Structure formats: structure tokens, C-alpha cells
Amino acid sequence: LTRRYFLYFKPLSQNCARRYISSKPLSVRQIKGDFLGQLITVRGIITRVSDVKPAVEVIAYTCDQCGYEVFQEVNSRTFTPLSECTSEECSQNQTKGQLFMSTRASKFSAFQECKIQELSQQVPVGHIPRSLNIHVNGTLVRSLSPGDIVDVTGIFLLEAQFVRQHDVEERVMELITSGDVYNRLAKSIAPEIYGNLDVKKALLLLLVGGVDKRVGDGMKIRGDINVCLMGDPGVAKSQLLKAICKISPRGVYTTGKGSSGVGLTAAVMKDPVTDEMI
Amino acid sequence: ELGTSNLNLDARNLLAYKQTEDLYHQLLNYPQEVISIMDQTIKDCMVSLIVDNNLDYDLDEIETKFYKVRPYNVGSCKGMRELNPNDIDKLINLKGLVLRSTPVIPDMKVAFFKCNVCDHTMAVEIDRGVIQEPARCERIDCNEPNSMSLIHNRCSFADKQVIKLQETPDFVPDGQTPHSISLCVYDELVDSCRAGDRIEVTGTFRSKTYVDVVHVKKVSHNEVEEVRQITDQDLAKIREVAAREDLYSLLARSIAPSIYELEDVKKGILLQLFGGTNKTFTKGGRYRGDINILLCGDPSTSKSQILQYVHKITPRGVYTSGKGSSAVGLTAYITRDVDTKQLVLESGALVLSDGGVCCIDEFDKMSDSTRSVLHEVMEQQTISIAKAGIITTLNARSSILASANPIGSYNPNLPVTENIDLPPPLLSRFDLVYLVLDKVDEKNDRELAKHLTNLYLEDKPEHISQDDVLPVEFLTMYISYAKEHIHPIITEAAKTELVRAYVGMRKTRQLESMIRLAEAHAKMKLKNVVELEDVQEAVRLIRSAIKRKLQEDLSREIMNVLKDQASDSMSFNELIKQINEHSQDRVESSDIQEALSRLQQEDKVIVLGEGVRRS
Amino acid sequence: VDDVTGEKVREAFEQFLEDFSVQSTDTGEVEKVYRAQIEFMKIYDLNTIYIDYQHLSMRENGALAMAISEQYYRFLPFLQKGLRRVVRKYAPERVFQISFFNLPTVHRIRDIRSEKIGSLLSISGTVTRTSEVRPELYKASFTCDMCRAIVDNVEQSFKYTEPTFCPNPSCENRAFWTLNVTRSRFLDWQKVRIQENANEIPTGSMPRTLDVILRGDSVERAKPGDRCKFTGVEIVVPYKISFLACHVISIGDEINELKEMVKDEHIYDKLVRSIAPAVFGHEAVKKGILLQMLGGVHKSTVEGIKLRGDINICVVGDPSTSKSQFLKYVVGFAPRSVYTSGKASSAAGLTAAVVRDEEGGDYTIEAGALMLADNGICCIDEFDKMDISDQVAIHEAMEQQTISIAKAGIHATLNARTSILAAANPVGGRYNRKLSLRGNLNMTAPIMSRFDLFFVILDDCNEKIDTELASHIVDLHMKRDEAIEPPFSAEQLRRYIKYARTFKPILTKEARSYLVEKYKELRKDDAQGFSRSSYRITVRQLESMIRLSEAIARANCVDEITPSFIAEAYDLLRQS
Amino acid sequence: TGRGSSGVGLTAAVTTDRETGERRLEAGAMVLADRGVVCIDEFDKMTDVDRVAIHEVMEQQTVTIAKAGIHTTLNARCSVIAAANPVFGQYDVNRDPHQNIALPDSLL
């Protein structure tokens, strides 16, 4: 009741783990069920976030007859109003006078729900990236802006405590030393089709991206390429598209009609579990 | 003596006083208790003032009268963003503008209960939002246990009203968007605050969160900040940079250093955001210094850049685009708010941007039904809605910045009034047009490519400061000082050069545009009196901003084959046939198709049928 | 506390209605006319009486009126029971309606607070929309759950009610009785929309509207699109604060200045240059605009049909002129003036479109510029870009003075008298002197007709008046210049317009004998014409100069018109 | 029959159960036969939802579903036998063979 501060935790890194486990990057498919109550560090994108709302922790009731203000503690999503007086003066009395609520002495918390999603290359073959719910409270309430990758460390009831955001040389030098690196990397991707080295060579330059330029005066230009494939039927088109989305990370296959109108923009929808406008 | 029970109290006086420093630090956390005990103490000190002097019967009404206190002199805050949960039930102040006033809802302070079988009445009152409903009778005539009934048409109510408020603090953090707070007024303060005014408001922050208003300030020896604060050294730098000769181009170079020259276009948007002079009469007249601009010509140049840059300069404006903004999105509309599940009304597209500029792209692809509202805001600057639920004329003080495209894909062989596919009149009512055509050649586009790769020469533009270019923060301060400190008058001395500037376009909308252009020329360079040289450049501006064989033969032939047809229709075929029939000037049947389309659409001639041609 | 006060106020109201008979012969002493009013309605049995509040304010030194005035809803059945007892004792299917009128204070819609809930109030404003008439429940026949017994239940005009106990002790339940409509009692109920007047709107505020309910025989009297004054009770609706009206009415040094302004001789010359001080030149357009504000007699007949006694004014010419400035002046000066842009209009929109309400999907009729501001100037900018439907609706509104609306089964026609200020432009914009007005205006002959005067404005390069026009334009561009200033303000011009409006002159025989020769002289120009002449001359131009004659008679404030003042109207018709 | 499926099509459907107080999955058809054959008559009366479903399970030879509380992929290599009728009712050699089919080119 007199808590001026807010207590939070953070786990140890892998560098302190090798130097004499508890904090492993966990998937939502790697939850198994039995980890309900362990501190877990989950990695993933954030698609759904909610607004900051004040959730009460303890309800303060005041009386004019006795003066002893009482405090009850809520734990669930809902509660009931304690209209009956449970003070230390009304027990030894015939009168059981009315009680009122105080929105000032009651302790609140900045509650916010969020939906963490499974990472694209961490999902198995054929499976879809299912979601999970994270319930945050306090000062961590503004550390989650949608459209990013995050590592969330918290207990699993998800009550987050701390958030953060973002042999190999032999593998790159043996790819370099063979000679004609550009043409080898061009003809290496998607070899189940015939020819078209130029189109897929520009697809190689498309997925490598380019350089984002900032003038440092409030103006940002694109450092990206956008490629059109206009063609007649008979030659394969979905295979090159599927190979580009399978090789490159975070590749999402779309369509023309269907739920595409709501599949390209935010779509308002009611949420039943918490009952709100998400 | 006049019956005003309200008392306006300044808390700053309680702050500077030697004895009450413990009272100002006690009312900021608990206002509900101190207002309730202040109502008793003000009545006690007033009756102490009554008993000190000889008086008539004034105690017969003040014994039951109630008096309250409205504290407003408190320091500023950062809106709703700084309102953390430790600031609940504390006093707070918000500065902004209100947008929507709901109808008055009643709140049941009391309630009647009647025993429907024996008819004894009981009045109950409110207590922290609960109304105890008595179960059975208790009198001596109706002792039996039976159900009561609630009556309300005989119970007094009090006024309540929820008001939408668009907040804007003195300082805003990076990434913050403007917020819409739902405030709620009570009795004796209803219909005093309504949409359209800059309102300072103060009250108690509650929790969904809201603010329970204790005072409003409809009006504004104090240090209350009105405009963006400047110092004396910055004012001296403004006066020293305003005395130079090249300032007229310096600003036009400093408004956008990432692009090219665009002297007429950049000079026009510079004086468009300078505004001009807005003068009115006492009761029935108003005039605003304003220019509505349009851009047309060759594509793929800095047009959208400008359309975004100005949205990043003005504090009020919307980026409306093409067919995605209809008439229900351009003024105001009703909405069923699912929040309170009530029919609220909300202003969009032209009343959200009341002040500043408004940017429209793809003017030619816009529909004809929504062109009628911009036909009124061209020079009338008003919105007159007459529909179901609303008959309201309102302010549309903003200026439009529209980017358009010509027909096809530019053609100098066709006139300017037919190439951009729109009405001449409405366009005659346009204050400023801009031919932003490229007309590609040598020793120009080479410098264009060189300037675009000169910032690609280095990885970071740290070397942007050693040139004649003012910074953005000095520019907006100079512009905000000049827009609110200079009211220039257009004297009679510039009469003679205006008449002759009008007759050159005549050999009233152009005259109304050029006087606002000349007063904006007077708005710059710190001038209070307009000068004779200032209109010269203005006219050069509108003369440089705007800088037949085909159709003739066409019609000619059409006439011919008509004549030779005994006036019957000319065929598509025969048309094409005689028209290529001459080797000289090569009328390609496609070009033919096009010009034909033009005349017909120009309504000069009529053609029908996909497979045939009609004269 | 009002259970014993209601019988006392019922006794006081019936003593007020019983102690006052009629002794009104020879305009002597006064006493109220209520008993003869009941004796007159005895034959017709409508029972929709009218009681003046000013006539009720004299008893108990006004204290009876002040006690009834705050507790009106709590004293209303006692008042109707006292009225029922006095008509049961003075006279031998029974509905009653008590209406109060003529309040000494007129309250606006912005001064309504919650302190007057249940009290009576006078609300003035303008009606925006009207709904259909509907049968209101009154009393219903409820049947029990087991008894199947009829109960005649009386509603209390609030919401669907329900009994509590069955009268027959065969049951004592409180479950849902079922409603029955055979032994039920229906009537007319209407819900209209009242809104804030244009002369009392605050600066920057919105004209807030509200819905007012109405019962009895006060329905089907309020015409849509007129200034109205209601008297009723403030009743809350689940909440919202609505109103219930019982009375309907169709409302809507000074003489030392007026008598000084009617005794001179140069008033009309300052009037033609003071009706539009912001426009340089164009005295003919100013003459037609000044004579188009006030008309003549419309009931000049012996058959029984009203005629078109109004002046239609239409302006044409090249663009970028000052002809829209008059359009911006009329609406800023005339109180009975509605302006429309033309392109943002339609047929239904101009007069009365229909919009749905979801409570029962029911329709309500929104008005418009058309059929508003009666005996005023309706000004339509851009008359040639309108459709065919609104222009034939304008022609149907000009062929007959009434307008008919047939929608959703209901047919309603209403009186309308407006003067059209039509601003038009050519098909090419530039006015060519090559041909007639018909091919350049591009509109058909019946909508081109019923127009009293056409104003054609052509411009060219004439430096001597052009330099003066440009100097006037640049001299106007300053803070409230004296150059624009008229010889006299609008302060006496508004009361002069009203004083000339209530004049009603009568033409003479010498004027008619000169008028027949003037019509022969005007029709003689049609012979060997095709020069200057541009249109046909028939009865309509004769009617236009006849209507301009009484307008110039009213402007010069003469009761009997001389042909010398009609000679200026003949010259005005010759100038066009 | 190609028209009349209670779910969203043949492959599956969502249901609510008060036993568990939750939502379960119902398997209407194509997910039952995993190696056999399925026959759809009146192919032109079949809506676009099942058309999008057979666009995905044709060469894919499987299916995938992500719904409120589940994400998964199923394997079902079946063979389809579709029978259709034209929209004109009759067809002859002189009419064009593309518009008489009343189906998109992707389904061809």
C-alpha cells in the first residue's frame, strides 16, 4: 500500500552463463505447457498492442461513521463491491452504515496487453506462426511500439519484467574463393526453372536491398528496389516468388482477392477475451 | 450586490503569500475536500463582514445560499502525456481547442418513491453514485410489506455535458500526435464553452480517464505566453538579417535546400505561408489575405516533396488525396461512437485544418461532386451544409495547395486551358497557377544530376552549413513574428501601376489575388507601408508562372464531309482517310482519334458508335 | 404536498373559469370570453380550447399564474378535471386539450437550462424537418394471463406501461398481461424539428436544433420552412431534453427620420446608388435589385385565383465581373434571403428531400432554400449548370404559387412566394452580340419565361471608366475606407423598405391610357426589327412593366401612380 | 454436391462446445480421404472460398489453417473429379471455347 517503487527483474546473459541455461531464447512452440512459472525470454515480432489503461490493484473504501478506511485486494479481471462494512468498529455494533469508494487512495497500474507472434524462420515446415499473450504493468508500458522484433523476459502465468530489442568466416571465404561470385550466386538460387539469369539477377540485387540514405536535415529517401514481373502464362511465376520468400527471411506470401482489403491495412475488430476494441 | 455567487481565485497569490505556502501545497493533491470546506469558510467570513456593518435584510437569502471557488492560476503541464497514475484527483490545466459539444444530459440528484397501493412519497438523494431503493412501506397507514415504485418525472435533475477537446501544449515530445480528451462540464457552466475557440481549461483529473472542470478561460500584467517566445538578441538578429537585399531570394533558397531553384514556385509558397492581411468590418464584412495555389506540368519532379514539406511546416493541415476523400470526408459528419454508444458529430477535411494550409494531390482525378465545396472555399472561405440534421455555415479559412496533371501524359501545340482538362471559370477564380513543366535540355539537367549526386559524394552532409542558408528554427520564428506583428496597409500611391497591370491581362479575381500578393510582398522585409516596386515583381511573378492547326483542319474537314454528305455524318474512316490523305503534316489516326475526342468532348462536334465516325 | 394543493388550484382554476362571463357590449368593461367559447364549441365538440396567459395573470395579483407556471405538469390533471367539471355542469368519446399562449417573454433555444424542467416555455425559431402523423396509443385493453379479463388501461403519455394487479381476485400475479387494440384509444402525434434563428446565433457558434413533440389538434398547422413560436412544457426523453408544444402560430426618432425621408425629391437617386455601394457602375442592375425587394398586388382578381405579383431578376454576362458582389450583398443585408450555389443542389434538395430514421425506419422531410424566406429574395448563383429536374421544379413553382410534395403515401401542398435572383453565364462565357438571348443562354423557353428583367453586362477596354474602376478597387483595399460609403446608411433603409412594403398603392386611369399607347409603342419596334431587338414581346413583358409600376409607386411612396414614373420603367425595359 | 456445405467448405469448419466451453474443429470432407478420390458435380455453382481452397491444395497437395487459438498444416494428396455445366445452357463448336466455361484461367 505504501509502495513508492515498482520491482522488476532481468536475467543473466549467455556471456555470464559460460563464465560460471536460465535464460534461453524460447519459441512459443517450445513452451511445452510445463514451463508455466519459469522466467522465459521469448523472441518475436509484435503485431497487436493495446492502449495504456489504469487497472486497480487495491480498492479503498471510506466511511464517515467510523473513519477507518478499509482496503481490499483484487486479483482477477472482475470483482464485486463490498457494500457490507468489515471494519473493526462496526463488528461490535448494531449500526452497519454505508461505505464509499475512493479513486485517489486506490492504487492503480498502467496495464497493457500485447500479442507476441512466432518468428518466421523459427517456425517448422508447414506450420503457421501462432501467437501468445503478454500482460505488462508499470513503467514498461511504453517500451513496446508495434512493428518490431523484441526479446521479452518475464514469468509465465505473461507478466513481463524486462524487454530489449535489436566457422562462419570459412563459410563466407569458401563461397568467395571459387571465382565469379555474382554469376554463381545468381545461378545458385532457384535452379528448378529454366534460364532467365537477368530477371533473377535483378531479384538477387532486390533481396540484397541497397543503401538507405539520410540527409540529416529531416528528409529520408528510399534505399530499396521494387520489381515487376509482367508476363504471359506458360512460364513459371509462383515458383520464383516462393523461392525468394523461402530463401529470404520474413517473406510473406499474399494474394489479390479475399481478405486482402483488410490484409493490407489495419482492421478494427472487437476482442472477446479482454472485451475491447483492438 | 449583483448576485454573482462565483468567485475567481488566483492560486499564485496564495503561493507568494508568507502565511499560505502550506495551503497551496495542500490543495494540489486534495481539491475535493478543500473546495467543500472553502464553501463553508467563505460563507463564514462573509457573514463576519455582514455583522461588522449596518445593513438591511440581506441575511434572509445568504443563510441558504451557496458560494464556490474556481482556482485557475496554476502552472502548465505536458497535456495528458505527463498525467501519470500518481496525478489522479489533482488539479490540471489544458490549453487547446474544443471540437464537439454534445447535448445536455440530466443527472438525477434526487428521486421519488411511491407505494402504488397506498400513496406515500419518499425522496432519496445521491451519494457517490448509488441510490438506495427502499423495499417496503414504513408509515402507519401503510404498514403492510409491499413493493415501492420509482417516479422520476417529479425529481430534480442537474445539467451535464461531455465536450471533445483537441489538446496542444507549449512543448510537445518527438513522435507525439495530438490528442482528443473527453472533458465534462456541469451546471452553471453549460453552453459557455463550444467549438471554435482557443480555450485554457482547468479542473480535476479523474479515472478511461477524464477531467472534471473547475474553471474555463474563454479570454486571454502577466507572462502568459501567446506566441512562440523570442528574445531581444534573436529580434536583433531578425532585424539585422531583414535589412539585406538578397533576403527575397535567400528565404526562397533556405525553404528547401535539398531540391532545385524554383524561384516562382518557392517564392509563392513562401509568401503563401507568410499569409498577408486579414481585415474585417464591425458587423457584416470580412476579407482574408490568402492565395489558393495550383501546380501543373511535367511529372516526376519535386511536387510531392513540397506537398509533404509544407505538411511538416504548418501546425494544421491534412493530406487529402484523389478519389479517397469524398464530400462526407471533406467537411463534417455524424458518427455512432461505440465508446458511449451515442451519435456524436465530428469535423473532417476542412474544419480540422481551420488555419494554416491544406494539401491536395491529383486534382484532375478528383470527382465533380466534391468540386462544389472547393468552389465555395476558393474565395468565399465558407462551408454551407444543408442536410439531414444540420444547416450550418462555418469557417474555411485555410488555403489550398493542389498539385494537378494534364490530359494524356505536356503538349505545347494545344492551349493551356484545354490541356489540363478543367473549367476555365473556377480556374479564373484560382489565385495562382504554376507551370512546373520541365522542357528537358542541356546545361540544366546536368546540374540537376550533379546536385543530386553531390550529397552522394560524401556519406554524411555535415558540410551543409557553409552557404547562404537560414536554419529552420530561425525561419519559423521570423515567420511567426512577421505574421503576428505586421498589419500592412495598401496605400493609394501604388494605384497607377496596378491599373496597367490589370489591363495587360484584360487586353476581378486576378486583382483580388494580386492585392493579396502585393500585401504579402509588404508582409516580408518588415514593412508597414506598401511600396511601388513591390507590385512590379508580383506581376512578374504571375506573368512567369503561366509564361490549333490540328483541330482547325479537323473541323474544316468535318465541315467539308458534312457539306459533301448533304450534312450527313462524317465517317471515322473517311475522316482518317482524307486526314492522312495529305502527306504534309502527318496526322496520325491516333492523333486524329485524340483531337477528335477533344472537339467532341469540347462539344464542338458529335461522334457516336465504337466502330463508326460521325461528323 | 401537492395532493391537497391540487384540489385548491383546481378550485381556483374553476373559479377563474366560472366567475368570468361576457359583458363586452359597447366596448365597456372587460371580462373573459370562455363560457361563450365553450358554448360555441358545443356544436363541433373538438375541445381544443385557447386560454390566454395574459388574461390569467391578473388573478391573485399574478401569484396564481406564478404557482401554476412552475408546477404545470404536476397541476395539469387537476386543471383538466376542473375544466371537465365545468363543462359537465354547463353542458351535457371525450378528449380534452388545454392550450396556453401569448407569454410576455420569448426564450431562445440557447437559454434552456434544467431549472425549467416541467415548467411552461415559449420557444421561437425555424422548422427544419417535419414527420408523418402517427396514431398515439392513449388507452389500451389489456388481457390477463389466466383470467382472460379485459382491463381498460390509461397511458400517461410517457412510455409503454403495464398494470400491476389483476382486478378480479381469481389471480394475483404480476406476469405479462397481453395488449389488445379493439378496445383501445388512438389519435394524431407528430415530431418536428425546431432550430435556432439566423439573427440570434452567437459568433462562431453552431445553430443547435432540437426535436419538439406535438399532440391534439395543434398538428397539421405548422408549415415546413417558416418561423414558428411554440408554447409548451419541457419534458425529458430517455437522457435528452425535448419539448411538448400545445400552441402553434405562423409568426414572421424613427418616424422623424422616415417623415424627413419621404418629403424630399432626390431619394430615389441616392437609393439606386445606395443599394450596392461596393459596385462601380451598373445603375440598371441596381435599379432592378432595388425594385426586386418589394413587389405589388398578387390578389388582383374577381375570379378567385392569386397571380404572380413578384419580380424575377436574372443577371448575365462575361465572367470576372462584379455581378456576384450583389449576390454577396443581398444575403448579407436582407433578412429574408437564402443563397445557394446552384451546383450543390437538386430538385428535392432545393425544396424538401426525405431522410430516414432508424427507430422505425420512418421518413422525415428536410426543407431547403426553396419555400423559405417568403416574400423575400432567393438567390441562385450559376443557374445554367443545374439539372433538368430542379429547373422544371422551379418552373412548377413559378407556374403556380403553391408547391406539392407527394411522397410515402402522403400528399402535401403549401403556399410559396419568392423572388428569384438568377445569376447565369453563357455556354462559352464570352457574350457575343452576333445572335439572340435564347441560343446564348442555353435553356428552354418555359423556364426562360416568367422572368421580369434580364441584365446583360458586356466589358471592353474603355480607359476613362476603367482607370476609375481600378482606382476604386485599389482604394477599397484598405481598412474600412470612406470611398465605399453611401449617402445614408442601411439603418433607415430597412424601416423605409418595411414602410414602403405596407403601403399598397392603386393605379390610375391616365396611367392606363398612357400604358396602352406605351405598349403599342414598344410593340411597334418589333415591326421592321432585327436591330437592337433581340426577343419577343407579348403579355408577359406587359405584366412585368405593370408590376414595376407599383414597385416604383411604393418606392416613391405615392398612392396614385402617374405615368411619368412608369416612363422610367418603360426606359428601363427599353435599356434591356 | 459442391453447394450445401455447412462449414466454410469441404475441408473444415469451426464449432463451439459448452462441454469444454471452447472452440473445436470439424472436418467436413477432403481431410477424410487422404489417398482416394473425391467427386464434385456442378462446379460452376461452387463459390470462391472453396475455389481459393482448391487453388491452394491442387499442386500443393495439402492445406493450412491458422485460427483463433491454433496454427497448423495438414497433408491430403487426393484426386479431384469435377463436372461442370455452361452458363449459357448449351454449347456448339462455332462458339468460342474459352468464355463458355464460366471459370478463370488459373482453374484451367
mmCIF file of C-alpha atoms in Angstrom, chain C residues 238-413:
data_model
loop_
_atom_site.group_PDB
_atom_site.id
_atom_site.type_symbol
_atom_site.label_atom_id
_atom_site.label_comp_id
_atom_site.label_asym_id
_atom_site.label_seq_id
_atom_site.Cartn_x
_atom_site.Cartn_y
_atom_site.Cartn_z
ATOM 1 C CA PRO C 238 -34.521 8.956 -22.414
ATOM 2 C CA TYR C 239 -31.296 11.427 -21.494
ATOM 3 C CA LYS C 240 -32.368 14.162 -23.894
ATOM 4 C CA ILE C 241 -34.278 17.339 -23.138
ATOM 5 C CA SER C 242 -37.172 17.534 -25.584
ATOM 6 C CA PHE C 243 -40.254 19.758 -25.662
ATOM 7 C CA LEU C 244 -44.037 19.406 -25.885
ATOM 8 C CA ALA C 245 -45.977 22.185 -27.605
ATOM 9 C CA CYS C 246 -49.695 22.917 -27.426
ATOM 10 C CA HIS C 247 -49.953 26.172 -29.389
ATOM 11 C CA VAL C 248 -48.805 26.897 -32.932
ATOM 12 C CA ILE C 249 -48.619 30.231 -34.769
ATOM 13 C CA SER C 250 -47.065 31.480 -38.024
ATOM 14 C CA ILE C 251 -45.071 34.448 -36.753
ATOM 15 C CA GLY C 252 -42.892 36.444 -39.161
ATOM 16 C CA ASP C 253 -36.825 59.385 -33.921
ATOM 17 C CA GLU C 254 -37.652 56.592 -36.352
ATOM 18 C CA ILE C 255 -40.791 58.295 -37.673
ATOM 19 C CA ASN C 256 -38.883 61.614 -37.515
ATOM 20 C CA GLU C 257 -36.328 60.128 -39.919
ATOM 21 C CA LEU C 258 -38.990 58.442 -42.073
ATOM 22 C CA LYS C 259 -41.127 61.582 -42.472
ATOM 23 C CA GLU C 260 -37.978 63.559 -43.289
ATOM 24 C CA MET C 261 -37.006 60.969 -45.882
ATOM 25 C CA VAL C 262 -40.401 60.919 -47.611
ATOM 26 C CA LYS C 263 -40.729 64.691 -48.038
ATOM 27 C CA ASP C 264 -37.723 65.355 -50.290
ATOM 28 C CA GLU C 265 -37.327 64.799 -54.017
ATOM 29 C CA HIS C 266 -33.914 63.197 -54.591
ATOM 30 C CA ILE C 267 -34.406 59.990 -52.524
ATOM 31 C CA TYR C 268 -34.598 57.540 -55.476
ATOM 32 C CA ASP C 269 -31.331 58.793 -56.984
ATOM 33 C CA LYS C 270 -29.471 58.043 -53.746
ATOM 34 C CA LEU C 271 -31.425 54.791 -53.457
ATOM 35 C CA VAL C 272 -30.155 53.465 -56.781
ATOM 36 C CA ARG C 273 -26.556 54.245 -55.798
ATOM 37 C CA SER C 274 -27.007 53.149 -52.182
ATOM 38 C CA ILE C 275 -28.462 49.670 -52.736
ATOM 39 C CA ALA C 276 -24.974 48.457 -53.746
ATOM 40 C CA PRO C 277 -22.214 50.867 -52.695
ATOM 41 C CA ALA C 278 -19.403 48.407 -53.397
ATOM 42 C CA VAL C 279 -20.173 48.165 -57.119
ATOM 43 C CA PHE C 280 -18.901 50.779 -59.574
ATOM 44 C CA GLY C 281 -21.279 51.490 -62.439
ATOM 45 C CA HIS C 282 -24.328 49.344 -63.380
ATOM 46 C CA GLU C 283 -27.271 51.561 -62.416
ATOM 47 C CA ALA C 284 -29.809 49.381 -64.276
ATOM 48 C CA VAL C 285 -28.838 46.249 -62.307
ATOM 49 C CA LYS C 286 -29.050 48.287 -59.085
ATOM 50 C CA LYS C 287 -32.479 49.593 -60.195
ATOM 51 C CA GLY C 288 -33.779 46.066 -60.752
ATOM 52 C CA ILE C 289 -32.256 44.805 -57.494
ATOM 53 C CA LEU C 290 -33.827 47.746 -55.586
ATOM 54 C CA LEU C 291 -37.206 47.183 -57.243
ATOM 55 C CA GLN C 292 -36.905 43.414 -56.801
ATOM 56 C CA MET C 293 -37.061 43.581 -52.994
ATOM 57 C CA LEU C 294 -40.594 44.961 -52.911
ATOM 58 C CA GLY C 295 -43.449 43.784 -55.124
ATOM 59 C CA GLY C 296 -47.068 44.514 -55.888
ATOM 60 C CA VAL C 297 -50.564 43.066 -55.509
ATOM 61 C CA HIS C 298 -50.976 39.304 -56.058
ATOM 62 C CA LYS C 299 -54.731 39.064 -55.423
ATOM 63 C CA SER C 300 -55.795 41.413 -58.244
ATOM 64 C CA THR C 301 -58.784 39.375 -59.406
ATOM 65 C CA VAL C 302 -62.536 38.843 -59.411
ATOM 66 C CA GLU C 303 -62.411 35.116 -60.194
ATOM 67 C CA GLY C 304 -60.656 33.951 -57.044
ATOM 68 C CA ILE C 305 -57.109 32.980 -58.034
ATOM 69 C CA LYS C 306 -53.882 34.576 -56.883
ATOM 70 C CA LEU C 307 -51.490 35.915 -59.510
ATOM 71 C CA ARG C 308 -47.726 36.236 -59.728
ATOM 72 C CA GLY C 309 -47.128 39.632 -58.157
ATOM 73 C CA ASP C 310 -43.385 39.195 -57.756
ATOM 74 C CA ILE C 311 -40.302 40.439 -59.625
ATOM 75 C CA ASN C 312 -37.879 37.937 -61.148
ATOM 76 C CA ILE C 313 -34.355 39.252 -61.787
ATOM 77 C CA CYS C 314 -31.691 37.486 -63.854
ATOM 78 C CA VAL C 315 -28.111 38.635 -64.468
ATOM 79 C CA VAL C 316 -25.947 37.516 -67.419
ATOM 80 C CA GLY C 317 -22.621 38.471 -68.906
ATOM 81 C CA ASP C 318 -18.946 37.692 -69.208
ATOM 82 C CA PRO C 319 -17.060 36.250 -66.192
ATOM 83 C CA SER C 320 -14.833 38.023 -63.627
ATOM 84 C CA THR C 321 -17.406 40.789 -63.168
ATOM 85 C CA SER C 322 -18.931 42.317 -60.053
ATOM 86 C CA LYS C 323 -22.328 40.649 -60.597
ATOM 87 C CA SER C 324 -21.737 38.126 -57.810
ATOM 88 C CA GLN C 325 -20.981 41.018 -55.450
ATOM 89 C CA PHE C 326 -24.677 41.952 -55.470
ATOM 90 C CA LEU C 327 -25.293 38.252 -54.628
ATOM 91 C CA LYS C 328 -22.983 38.620 -51.659
ATOM 92 C CA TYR C 329 -24.697 41.840 -50.609
ATOM 93 C CA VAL C 330 -28.347 40.767 -50.681
ATOM 94 C CA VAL C 331 -27.629 37.782 -48.365
ATOM 95 C CA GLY C 332 -25.576 39.993 -46.053
ATOM 96 C CA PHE C 333 -28.258 42.665 -45.831
ATOM 97 C CA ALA C 334 -31.723 41.237 -46.494
ATOM 98 C CA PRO C 335 -33.043 39.130 -43.577
ATOM 99 C CA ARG C 336 -35.374 37.190 -45.855
ATOM 100 C CA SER C 337 -32.628 35.960 -48.168
ATOM 101 C CA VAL C 338 -31.427 32.425 -48.890
ATOM 102 C CA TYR C 339 -28.393 31.893 -51.116
ATOM 103 C CA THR C 340 -27.486 28.736 -52.996
ATOM 104 C CA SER C 341 -24.530 27.852 -55.199
ATOM 105 C CA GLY C 342 -26.620 26.036 -57.807
ATOM 106 C CA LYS C 343 -24.251 23.121 -58.443
ATOM 107 C CA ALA C 344 -24.611 21.916 -54.830
ATOM 108 C CA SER C 345 -28.372 21.464 -55.195
ATOM 109 C CA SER C 346 -31.037 19.241 -56.733
ATOM 110 C CA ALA C 347 -34.810 19.031 -57.065
ATOM 111 C CA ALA C 348 -35.583 17.520 -53.666
ATOM 112 C CA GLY C 349 -32.667 19.364 -52.083
ATOM 113 C CA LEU C 350 -33.996 22.731 -53.208
ATOM 114 C CA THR C 351 -37.395 22.256 -51.573
ATOM 115 C CA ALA C 352 -37.857 19.102 -49.424
ATOM 116 C CA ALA C 353 -35.742 15.931 -49.508
ATOM 117 C CA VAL C 354 -36.548 12.806 -47.484
ATOM 118 C CA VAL C 355 -34.294 11.160 -44.903
ATOM 119 C CA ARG C 356 -34.825 8.047 -42.801
ATOM 120 C CA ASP C 357 -34.788 7.493 -39.034
ATOM 121 C CA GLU C 358 -33.903 4.076 -37.637
ATOM 122 C CA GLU C 359 -36.318 3.881 -34.677
ATOM 123 C CA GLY C 360 -38.849 2.519 -37.167
ATOM 124 C CA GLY C 361 -37.174 3.294 -40.474
ATOM 125 C CA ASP C 362 -39.553 6.240 -40.746
ATOM 126 C CA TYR C 363 -39.142 9.207 -43.056
ATOM 127 C CA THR C 364 -38.763 12.878 -42.241
ATOM 128 C CA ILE C 365 -38.900 15.775 -44.684
ATOM 129 C CA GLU C 366 -35.945 18.174 -44.721
ATOM 130 C CA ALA C 367 -36.594 21.591 -46.275
ATOM 131 C CA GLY C 368 -34.184 23.888 -48.113
ATOM 132 C CA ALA C 369 -33.642 27.294 -49.691
ATOM 133 C CA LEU C 370 -36.819 26.825 -51.736
ATOM 134 C CA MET C 371 -40.053 27.516 -49.774
ATOM 135 C CA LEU C 372 -38.068 29.508 -47.178
ATOM 136 C CA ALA C 373 -37.895 33.289 -46.613
ATOM 137 C CA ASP C 374 -41.373 34.065 -48.007
ATOM 138 C CA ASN C 375 -41.802 37.467 -49.753
ATOM 139 C CA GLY C 376 -38.010 37.752 -49.928
ATOM 140 C CA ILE C 377 -35.183 37.076 -52.396
ATOM 141 C CA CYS C 378 -33.981 33.548 -53.107
ATOM 142 C CA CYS C 379 -30.673 33.922 -54.926
ATOM 143 C CA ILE C 380 -29.296 31.161 -57.148
ATOM 144 C CA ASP C 381 -25.737 31.519 -58.385
ATOM 145 C CA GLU C 382 -24.766 29.515 -61.521
ATOM 146 C CA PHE C 383 -28.266 28.885 -62.895
ATOM 147 C CA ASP C 384 -27.152 27.140 -66.090
ATOM 148 C CA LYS C 385 -25.142 24.290 -64.555
ATOM 149 C CA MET C 386 -28.217 22.964 -62.759
ATOM 150 C CA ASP C 387 -30.078 19.860 -63.880
ATOM 151 C CA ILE C 388 -33.392 19.455 -65.681
ATOM 152 C CA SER C 389 -35.326 18.239 -62.605
ATOM 153 C CA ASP C 390 -34.695 21.240 -60.346
ATOM 154 C CA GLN C 391 -35.304 23.644 -63.243
ATOM 155 C CA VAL C 392 -38.712 22.085 -64.021
ATOM 156 C CA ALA C 393 -39.385 22.146 -60.253
ATOM 157 C CA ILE C 394 -38.582 25.895 -60.351
ATOM 158 C CA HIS C 395 -40.937 26.182 -63.368
ATOM 159 C CA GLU C 396 -43.658 24.245 -61.499
ATOM 160 C CA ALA C 397 -43.079 26.579 -58.525
ATOM 161 C CA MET C 398 -43.383 29.600 -60.818
ATOM 162 C CA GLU C 399 -46.380 28.370 -62.829
ATOM 163 C CA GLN C 400 -48.471 28.072 -59.662
ATOM 164 C CA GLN C 401 -47.686 29.761 -56.352
ATOM 165 C CA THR C 402 -48.219 26.585 -54.359
ATOM 166 C CA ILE C 403 -45.893 23.588 -54.320
ATOM 167 C CA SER C 404 -46.932 19.954 -53.974
ATOM 168 C CA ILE C 405 -44.925 17.102 -52.455
ATOM 169 C CA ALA C 406 -46.175 13.549 -52.943
ATOM 170 C CA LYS C 407 -44.096 11.041 -51.022
ATOM 171 C CA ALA C 408 -44.611 7.847 -48.941
ATOM 172 C CA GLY C 409 -48.373 7.928 -49.393
ATOM 173 C CA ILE C 410 -48.812 11.478 -48.121
ATOM 174 C CA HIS C 411 -49.627 14.486 -50.310
ATOM 175 C CA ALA C 412 -48.910 17.977 -49.027
ATOM 176 C CA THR C 413 -49.124 21.316 -50.796
#
